[PDB]
């Protein structure tokens, strides 16, 4: 049997410290090709080890196609191949679009569904998984209006560190119980609540919308330091602003309440992904 392995790389859609992401062609179909830097090889090994353990298949998790290691003259090339979402990341999408009630709820419920699927242990099945780097750049927008969660390079299974802007207080003040798997679920719930805030800002009510901003845009610099974030989140205990205009809208009022219950200083007081899913389904 012939095995057609050739991928044509067509355009670069992402470049960073991690490496690059390319739109590629395989047998007439779009694929996304993440090429890792040597600096970030451990992210390729973690994501590969996870998918070798459990082949995740969920509509709100970026679809795995392949992990490839190729031998080069004086180096190894590490590639992760996934489904391609031509609408790009939620971060990208929120900059140039506003949302209505239905599209805002569809986005956040799809993210909650993906996250609950990661978090749940299923017997027979999958281990429980914490993402550890949830943010709007690690969420992709699909044509059907739902999103999917990407990048399991920092993920931890039960049975590089997170982006500083989205770190929970217990990460910033180094009190997180590192031995306790539920601590990592609670870290993801904090980051989820910041994503919920980013999205809700872009939902129109009464002819009003907020400009896209990243969480804590008004209180920390670009590329905030660990110390910058610790002072805001742990010492001053600041939380993202809820604008007055949200309290005229039943959807945004319910989402504000949800956000608050993701941001408790005490990690054990935070809602579970499954409770967020239920709350979101009952809105509107
Ligand atoms: C090695 O590398 C890559 C390969 C492929 C690829 C292309 N055609 C066919 C296949 C294939 C799948 C499954 C079987 C078998 C399974 C069990 N058996 C009992 C019956 C049938 C055979 C062949 C593959 C795996 C795609 C890749 O990327 C998109 C690869 O990596 C770049
Ligand atoms: C990596 O991804 C893709 C792979 C393929 C692909 C290519 N050749 C053969 C296969 C295949 C055939 C048969 C089995 C099974 C059937 C039942 N039992 C006997 C066990 C073995 C498995 C695999 C596949 C899945 C196509 C894709 O898309 C069109 C892929 O995605 C881009
Ligand atoms: C976050 O993480 C990963 C993401 C992806 C991924 C999958 N589909 C589509 C994309 C994408 C496409 C296009 C744009 C822009 C560029 C062109 N124009 C300016 C508007 C649209 C942005 C994003 C990506 C980046 C793949 C990954 O791995 C192979 C990722 O890593 C796990």
Could you walk me through the main structural features you see in this protein, from its secondary elements to its overall organization?
The chain is an alpha+beta fold. It is built from eight helices and nine strands. It has two domains: 1-86, no CATH class; 87-284, no CATH class. 33% of the residues lie in helices and 18% in strands. A five-stranded antiparallel sheet has the order 1-2-3-5-4, with helices on one face. A hairpin with a 2-residue loop joins β4 (64-72) and β5. α3 packs antiparallel against α8 and α5 (181-201) packs antiparallel against α7. The structure holds ligand LU8 (3 copies).
Concise overview:
With 284 residues, the protein is an alpha+beta fold. The chain has helices at residues 41-53, 90-96, 101-119, 169-172, 181-201, 226-235, 250-260, 273-282, and strands spanning 8-16, 19-26, 29-36, 64-72, 75-82, 129-130, 139-141, 147-149, 156-157. Strands 1-2-3-5-4 form a five-stranded antiparallel beta sheet, with helices on one face. A two-stranded antiparallel sheet has the order 6-9.
């Amino acid at each position: 049997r012939t095995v057609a392995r050739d991928i044509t790389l067509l355009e670069c859609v992402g470049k960073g410290r991690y490496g690059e992401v390319w739109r590629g062609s395989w047998q007439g179909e779009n694929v996304a090709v993440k090429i890792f830097s040597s600096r970030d090889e451990k992210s390729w090994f973690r994501e590969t080890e996870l998918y070798n353990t459990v082949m995740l298949r969920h509509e709100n998790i970026l679809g795995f196609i392949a992990s490839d290691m190729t031998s080069r003259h004086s180096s190894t090339q590490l590639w992760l191949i996934t489904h391609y979402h031509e609408m790009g990341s939620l971060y990208d999408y929120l900059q140039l679009t506003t949302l209505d009630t239905v599209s805002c709820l569809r986005i956040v419920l799809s993210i909650a569904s993906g996250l609950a699927h990661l978090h749940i242990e299923i017997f027979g099945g999958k281990p429980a998984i914490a993402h550890r780097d949830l943010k709007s750049k690690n969420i992709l927008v699909k044509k059907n209006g739902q999103c999917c969660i990407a990048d399991l390079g920092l993920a931890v299974m039960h049975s590089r560190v997170g982006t500083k802007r989205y770190m929970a207080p217990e990460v910033l003040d180094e009190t997180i119980q590192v031995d306790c798997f539920d601590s990592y679920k609670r870290v993801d719930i904090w980051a989820f609540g910041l994503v919920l805030w980013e999205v809700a800002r872009r939902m129109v009510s009464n002819g009003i919308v907020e400009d896209y901003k990243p969480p804590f845009y008004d209180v920390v610099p670009n590329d905030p330091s660990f110390e910058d974030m610790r002072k805001v989140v742990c010492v001053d205990q600041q939380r993202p602003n809820i604008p007055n205009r949200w309290f005229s809208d039943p959807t945004l009022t319910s989402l504000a309440k949800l956000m608050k219950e993701c941001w408790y200083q005490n990690p054990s007081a935070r809602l579970t992904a499954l409770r967020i899913k239920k709350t979101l389904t009952k809105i509107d």
